[PDB]
Design a binder for this molecule. Structure first.
Ligand SMILES: Nc1ncnc2c1ncn2[C@@H]1O[C@H](COP(=O)(O)OP(=O)(O)OP(=O)(O)O)[C@@H](O)[C@H]1O
Ligand SMILES: Nc1ncnc2c1ncn2[C@@H]1O[C@H](COP(=O)(O)OP(=O)(O)OP(=O)(O)O)[C@@H](O)[C@H]1O
Ligand SMILES: Nc1ncnc2c1ncn2[C@@H]1O[C@H](COP(=O)(O)OP(=O)(O)OP(=O)(O)O)[C@@H](O)[C@H]1O
Lengths: 50, 388, 322, 148, 321, 56, 55
């Protein structure tokens, strides 16, 4: 049980702390923004093809 | 109004016996129900009763010709159920005889493979008689129906004739399988049953990668990995849990196979400095019997994966037609028969075919992956031994 | 690994066994020795399937004779007042269970109808006979599947009357005592003979130090199975040094006997390891003589307490007498 | 790995969102699958890391043994212990290969199980989508988006 | 000639026996021990014969009363709705099996029908009782599963603890245990007495050389049963020359003991002839320790390894010590 | 021919004991009636087995 | 239950009508004869002999 611990908080905090405040939130918003457009272009295609 | 097997046409006058009972399309359909109902009732208590492991691992002869026949027999039975439901769309009557005979045939086929699998593990071949007295019982009546469809001149235009003509061959093919088991094992009305023992590779308790020694469906599904994965979640994996690999995959056995290929490749070709061409020929000759199997599965997997896009095209094309008017347009003998050109035009039928094709495609693709990996891992063992 | 478990569930891998043929009698025996909820499911399914299978063929005969056809008074159906499959199911239920309402009944000149009626009755009689036999033997045998015999988790080697004795406690959790209880104790060891013989699990039988030298034991209140380790006893060289867990020194105590109520002989084996044997300990007295009867404190049944005792080897103990 | 994980998980949630929007019934059908999927995911992870770690450990001795056999070839052959070292290699090669083979089997078991789960989603999405378009007059393009 | 077969058939001939009772009560036991196909055939025949026999007599009664004659009359028939022998057969089926449809029913017309209805019911009730009684007895036979014990095809004379001893092997193929096991070893010989008596087949008990000096054993794994050939045994005058097929010697080993699951005593008799007694051989160890559980190799159950043993007489061998 | 609880009591007597007079009988078009008939027949048979087993 | 007792109804163990006393191996010995009629074996047969007299 102790071995099978992903340690997510520790590893995520290390990457988050090293990355800082600006370049961490930017990546989250940028990646999410890119994918919401991908859903949108398919959805817009459906409406146009309709 | 009440659920009627034959139907409620002309004041339920479809139950007439005159002009021969066998000439009645409802009765030949009903005769088909009987062998399936027989097997369900006969073997249901038997499966409920039985409900190291090496002593119960022997595979009956034709262990592969049975599963692939069952799967294709399951596929045509799914098509029969789908076709029957298409056939009763026109009339208001339920016409339960169109699909219920075929529907529970698929159910009975599932129980037959379950019952056979239990006999395959628990080496009690003497019970493999119910299936025999069922398969011919499932063949005879089906032949009657087929001949009757030929008696009324149904022809190959109707989809039911094609499915029935194909389904009788499938029943015939596995009927040969059942008597083939009898011929090899010689347990029914025979004098000396031939002795068949489980492979010596699994006799040792030091084999845990039981991929060669497992049913074909679990070979393509990796069902044996469930016990190991569940065990992994509690006891961490150590080399004790992963007992050594079977003799078919051992490094020494692989090197013997690699060494014998080199002797063949260097004997006839006297001017063979064992260069790139000789080594490549040795690798091809040693592991070609498995690389081709991986390619055959992979090529079939690629072809099936394309049926998905075709299925989407058919589904959306039928849906785009706002008319939504469906009819089989013909009634051969008081029962409407649908044609193949409209069977693959229905959206629900196409969706079911897409689901079935997806199941087959993913199994074949993953099966090809493992075959290539096993050959690749086996070559690594052999190549390392030769280098050392 | 141990060849006998603490709970008496011996487990030895009988690997590479010659394939003795399987027979349908084994399946029939498995039906008899099934559990109670499973037996109900098997027989309910058997009864329901039997009625359903015969109802199907009853429907066939009526269909093939034109009985299921629309109304016509000229013909006489093979079964009267049979219209649908629901009536066919009801007719099969009435015939097999022998209710026989009579609204739907067999008629003459239909030889197939007479033949199936004979077949259904014969099948129904054999199915009912099996159910009675299975139920009859279930009550007789399944009652004797309970093991209410408790040993001690850990045995001791104490000093009684000057001689070393290996002792363990066994009690009965059922009021009815075991009749003619026979105790068998065996030391299991990979004893390689000096001549050259090697045997992996050689069993040496051990005496009982009873009042007569026999193996009879009365089980009312739990007693101590004390065996005096002497020169004849293989435990003559027992030492706490060889008492560690990884030592091949294991004791098997088996108390066979027959329970008075049912009459079926019962066996309850137990295995004691060297690590499970506590050297130089004494069992706590149990039976207190109250005013009217005797009190047994089963909570302190298998609890062993230390006592100042010699800790040498029984073989070395012979020097003290010398 | 971080970039691939984010894209893979975002593509996954995007797919379920579209299918639920295309057919609200799928939301109900998402409850069973998202339950069993977790089990498949949870068990595989525990079976993967151990296997992956075991694989890496089993690579260390084999390759090291090779180095020794060339740094001490003269002594190895002088002792006339070549046969024992060949047997040592075969045990080492078998241990590494079976570690790798089981990892592939674990990878394939997850892939087939997730493939069946995805195939079931296709049937559920198709069935609900055709039912919506035939009766409730769902957009034809929306049916295509759900299936794709 | 053999005293008992290798399997345990015990091929002996009985002759000159007085007149056996051969009563009626034994024939029922014959019906009890019938095979499954034969019991089904016997019982189907019995039920069918009962139904048919009564069917004939109901038809005769209807014939005697003049009821099946065509033409409706005011005379109420003995049994209603009887117009053929097929109807008479169905009525007999209904009464005996107790289906009782009611389409054909007994009437208060003639007392002969009432008397014969009693006979059919009692016979039907007693036949069911016999059928159920036979079912109970036969069901136990299925649970019996008697012969499943294994003995080596050949026995040995080896050196255990330095002393020569006769030895054989016993194995229990059954998963279930055999409680209260007992080994009985006997020598079947033709010995003469110093007073002129010549016993044809003398059986001498042979001790099992157990630790407690008893016949009790415990079979969970294949075990070696050995008797130390000493001055207190008839084998003390053995010799290597006593190995011919027609030599006057035989060893019988009997494994009594009640099976734990069945709770009934089972016997397993085996014989070892002189040619089946192998000097200078030892039984290979079988049980091999494994991480999971102890492993037993049943292929080598009868396999032996040759060992040099004193090819002398026990009388000379023991004295020379 | 069901008209009161007395008639219903008589019908249950007829079925569980397996007399089946036939004045009160099970018809079709009432699947709930058929299902309880199966349940009552199974319950009656299992009770008889218990009674016969207990007598033994 | 009568079916169970049908098998056990009859017993057919035969004893000699009269006994003998003749020396065997020098030692004086009383002797009787026993036998079984049925082919089926009698398992775990046990012989107990008693001298009954007024003492
Ligand atoms: N009062 C009791 N009732 C029932 N069984 C008992 C009792 N006392 C002991 N036993 C049984 O005796 C064995 C061990 O005896 P002991 O008195 O040493 O118990 P223990 O140390 O509590 O054992 P355990 O760890 O099995 O619970 C076990 O099989 C246990 O079930
Ligand atoms: N062949 C046999 N069949 C049946 N019983 C026998 C047989 N031989 C002996 N017996 C039984 O053993 C007893 C003693 O046998 P024996 O040879 O003395 O006969 P007997 O003197 O003719 O006997 P009796 O006059 O008592 O009938 C007989 O009385 C009988 O009970
Ligand atoms: N592995 C085994 N499993 C079961 N029974 C065995 C086994 N080995 C031997 N026996 C039994 O022991 C006897 C013969 O022992 P042996 O080891 O000599 O075998 P064998 O030479 O193969 O015999 P056979 O040809 O008679 O079968 C037979 O009664 C046989 O059934």
């Amino acid at each position: 049980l102790h071995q099978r611990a992903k340690i997510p908080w520790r590893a995520c905090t290390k990457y988050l702390s090293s990355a800082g405040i600006l370049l961490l939130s930017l990546l989250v918003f940028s990646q999410l923004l890119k994918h919401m457009v991908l859903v949108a272009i398919d959805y817009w295609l459906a409406k146009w093809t309709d | 109004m009440p659920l009627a097997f034959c139907g409620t046409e002309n004041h339920s006058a479809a139950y007439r016996v005159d002009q021969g009972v066998l000439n009645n399309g409802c009765f030949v359909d009903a005769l088909n129900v009987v062998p399936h109902v027989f097997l369900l009732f006969i073997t249901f208590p038997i499966l409920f009763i039985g409900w190291i492991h090496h002593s119960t691992w022997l595979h009956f002869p034709g262990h592969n010709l049975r599963w692939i026949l069952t799967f294709i027999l399951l596929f045509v039975l799914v098509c029969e159920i789908a076709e029957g439901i298409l056939s009763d769309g026109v009339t208001e009557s339920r016409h339960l005889h169109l699909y219920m005979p075929a529907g529970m045939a698929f159910m009975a086929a599932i129980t037959s493979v379950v019952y056979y699998h239990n006999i395959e593990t628990s080496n009690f071949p003497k019970l493999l008689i119910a299936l025999l007295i069922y398969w011919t019982l499932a063949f005879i009546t089906k032949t009657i129906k087929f001949v009757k469809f030929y008696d009324h001149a149904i022809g190959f235009s109707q989809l039911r004739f094609c499915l029935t003509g194909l389904l009788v061959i499938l029943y015939g093919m596995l009927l040969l399988v059942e008597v083939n088991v009898i011929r090899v094992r010689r347990y029914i009305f025979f004098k000396t049953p031939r002795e068949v023992k489980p492979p010596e590779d699994l006799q040792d308790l030091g084999v845990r990668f039981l991929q060669p020694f497992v049913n074909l469906l679990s070979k393509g599904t990796y069902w044996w990995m469930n016990a190991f994965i569940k065990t992994a979640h509690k006891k961490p994996i150590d080399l004790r849990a992963i007992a050594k690999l079977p003799i078919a995959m051992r490094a020494l056995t692989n090197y013997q196979r690699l060494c014998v290929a080199f002797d063949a490749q260097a004997r006839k070709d006297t001017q063979s400095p064992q260069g790139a061409r000789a080594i490549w020929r040795a690798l091809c000759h040693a592991f070609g019997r498995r690389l081709i199997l991986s390619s055959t599965f992979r090529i079939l997997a690629d072809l099936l994966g394309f049926a998905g896009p075709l299925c989407i095209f058919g589904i959306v094309d039928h849906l785009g037609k706002e008319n939504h008017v469906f009819q089989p347009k013909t009634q051969f003998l008081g029962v409407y028969f649908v044609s193949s050109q409209e069977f693959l035009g229905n959206a629900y039928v196409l969706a079911v075919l897409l689901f079935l094709a997806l199941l087959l495609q993913r199994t074949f693709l993953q099966a090809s992956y493992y075959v290539a990996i096993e050959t690749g891992i086996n070559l690594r063992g052999a190549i390392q031994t030769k280098i050392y | 690994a141990r060849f006998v478990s603490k709970k008496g569930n011996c487990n030895v891998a009988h690997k590479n066994i010659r394939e003795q043929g399987r027979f349908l009698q084994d399946v029939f025996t498995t039906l008899v020795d099934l559990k109670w909820p499973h037996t109900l499911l098997i027989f309910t399914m058997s009864f329901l399937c039997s009625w359903l299978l015969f109802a199907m063929v009853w429907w066939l005969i009526a269909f093939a004779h034109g009985d299921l056809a629309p109304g016509e008074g000229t013909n006489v159906p093979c079964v009267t007042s049979i219209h649908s499959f629901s009536s066919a199911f009801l007719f099969s239920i009435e015939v097999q269970v022998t209710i026989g309402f009579g609204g739907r009944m067999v008629t003459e000149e239909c030889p197939l109808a007479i033949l199936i009626l004979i077949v259904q009755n014969i099948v129904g009689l054999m199915i009912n006979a099996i159910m009675l036999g299975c139920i009859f033997m279930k009550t007789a045998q399944a009652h004797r599947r309970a093991e209410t015999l408790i040993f001690s988790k850990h045995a001791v080697i104490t000093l009684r009357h000057g001689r070393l004795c290996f002792m363990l406690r066994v009690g009965d959790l059922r009021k009815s005592m075991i009749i003619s209880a026979t105790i068998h104790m065996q030391v299991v060891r990979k004893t390689t003979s000096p001549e050259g013989e090697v045997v992996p699990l050689h069993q040496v039988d051990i005496p009982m130090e009873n009042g007569v030298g026999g193996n009879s034991i009365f089980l009312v209140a739990p007693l101590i199975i004390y065996h005096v380790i002497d020169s004849n006893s293989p435990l003559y060289d027992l030492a706490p040094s060889d008492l560690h867990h990884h030592q091949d020194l294991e004791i098997i105590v088996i108390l066979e006997g027959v329970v008075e109520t049912t009459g079926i002989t019962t066996q309850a084996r137990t295995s004691y390891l060297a690590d499970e044997i506590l050297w130089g300990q004494r069992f706590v007295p149990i039976v207190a003589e109250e005013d009217g009867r005797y009190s047994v404190d089963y909570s302190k049944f298998g609890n062993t307490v230390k006592v100042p005792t010699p800790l040498c080897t029984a073989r070395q103990l012979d020097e003290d007498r010398s | 790995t971080l970039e691939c994980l984010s894209r893979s998980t975002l593509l996954c949630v995007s797919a379920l969102t579209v299918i639920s929007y295309v057919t609200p019934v799928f939301l109900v059908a998402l409850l069973p699958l998202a339950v069993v999927c977790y089990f498949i995911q949870k068990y595989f992870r525990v079976a993967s890391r151990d296997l992956q770690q075991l694989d890496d450990t089993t690579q260390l001795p084999l390759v090291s043994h090779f180095a020794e056999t060339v740094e001490g070839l003269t002594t190895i052959r002088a002792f006339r212990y070549e046969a024992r070292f060949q047997q040592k290699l075969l045990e080492y090669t078998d241990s590494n290969n079976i570690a790798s083979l089981f990892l592939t089997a674990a990878n394939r078991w997850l892939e087939v199980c997730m493939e069946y789960i995805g195939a079931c989603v296709v049937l559920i999405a198709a069935a609900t989508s055709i039912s919506n378009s035939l009766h409730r007059e769902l957009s034809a393009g929306l049916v295509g988006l759900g299936l794709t």
